């Protein structure tokens, strides 16, 4: 199975534009360079398909990639269902994802009129209407912001790379 | 943030040498160390990666290890072809930059170590009459080919006005270099002596010249 | 085989703009970080920064941010390093190096593997100037010489007594001063007894100024 194409991928998505790679016909394997390896519904089997979801967030937002969490990531960027069967894997990526002047390129959604439903993706760049006045693309705010990752920030504010495997109903 | 290496190591063909590389917890402590070989007048080449892995074509005479915040390169069965600059490197997590070590010159000893022969010329009367003053420190016949040069006025260090060449191989396989101190005629006459001090293999040869 | 072919040697004056090139073949150019390392004549390797060809994302060292600019043309598999105003202090060999990701998860780092042949960038504000030649007076062998001051460009050659004198002759490689001009010395070791009797003349040839100077070197009184 081409799990290598997902874990060892040179470029990762912004969490708001999280990347999904469909895995179909092949076999899985085993995985000390990961700070988080948490499975839900199974434990370290065969399945119809495997989905590999991958993106970058802050270290202290990794708690939010789990069933029934809240926060700007779980609510407005990447939502897991309460009944989720799959594994959540993260690791510190300060070496690849932080830059001297601040890395702008990794963005998150800060504002949204309601919560995402589980596994929903929203790539919208449309101005968020907070107040009564409709917004002429200028109480009118841009909904995406940058993490600006810097190599010197504390572990909590460093970029972590996350891979979510979903198993729907490939053999281990 | 610097990865410090010894400037130079030497041994006989067939002997072993080790090259240390000391850093901090942001670089060698956390991250994979690589070594690069640079033969005279060539591009660097990867010699070791992931602390101790050899690319295809790199002989097992070359070995790497890392312990704490220091890495080591070993070369067994030293051969003529091993004579090169070697640089460690790694990613510095805190800097968000790759860093190369200060570099080590390996000399494969084909003759006895030779201390520099040093000749120190005062400014010519011709140059003093042109309102200039150059002390010329001519350094020859040293092996291996690394020196450091320090200048003294009386017994005080002099940093300003010093230009020193890189060592260069002579036809006899020893090395030449030169060091030039630029003064005003006034500075030259106002001191009892100037000294050129050439350090080689921890030993120093000093020549002195005096306005009279 | 992976190949990194760099642009040809560059001769420029301070204040000139300069873009050097490195073309990657033998691999998918687009999928690999690539970057630049600087080596000043006789100095250590200095990492400058890297670029991801796919989307021109960049990583600079402290020293190199704002000074220099790295760019890509993914369609001709070519990486570029660019100055808008060169200083003399930019004189160096510049190597491009591919930076595969080594390691796995938290151990993942950008890591130089393959290097190009290098691109020599020579930045000087100096023009053709013949040397001023000063005698290095001697005083059972005596050392005497010639100081060859303030010339451009390289090279100078030195002989003694029009080639009649080759033993004891050591002509030293030139220093490059801050001015951009060169100086070098030639010394000959001769019997002290000869100093009364034999004339010693160093023949300094600087073909690029069409200048030959034959300087008599006398013992000092
Ligand atoms: C990532 O790369 C290395 C091979 O160079 C290997 O040790 C590791 O298992 C790879 N991981 C995956 C998940 O394919």
Residue numbers in the entry:
A (entry chain A): 336 to 366, 372 to 384, 390 to 483, 487 to 517, 524 to 526
B (entry chain L): 2 to 213
C (entry chain H): 1 to 139, 146 to 227
The authors write:
The receptor-binding domain (RBD) on the spike proteins binds specifically with the cellular receptor angiotensin-converting enzyme 2 (ACE2) of its host cells, resulting in a fusion cascade and virus entry. We successfully generated human monoclonal antibodies (hmAbs) against the receptor binding domain (RBD) protein of SARS-CoV-2 using developed hybridoma technology. The isolated hmAbs against the RBD protein (wild-type) showed high binding activity and neutralized the interaction between the RBD and the cellular receptor angiotensin-converting enzyme 2 (ACE2) protein.
To investigate the interactions between antibodies and the RBD protein, the crystals structures of the two Fab RBD complexes were determined. The result showed that the 1D1 Fab and 3D2 Fab bind to different epitopes on RBD proteins, i.e. 1D1 Fab and 3D2 Fab bind to class I&II and class III RBD binding epitopes, respectively. The 3D2 binds to conserved epitopes among multi-variants. The results demonstrated that pairs of non-competing monoclonal antibodies could potentially be combined to form antibody cocktails (e.g., 3D2 and 1D1). The antibody cocktail, as well as 3D2 and 1D1 antibodies, demonstrated an IC50 value of <150 ng/ml for all SARS-CoV-2 variants. Pseudovirion-based neutralization results revealed that the antibody cocktail, 1D1 and 3D2, showed high potency in multiple variants of SARS-CoV-2 infection.
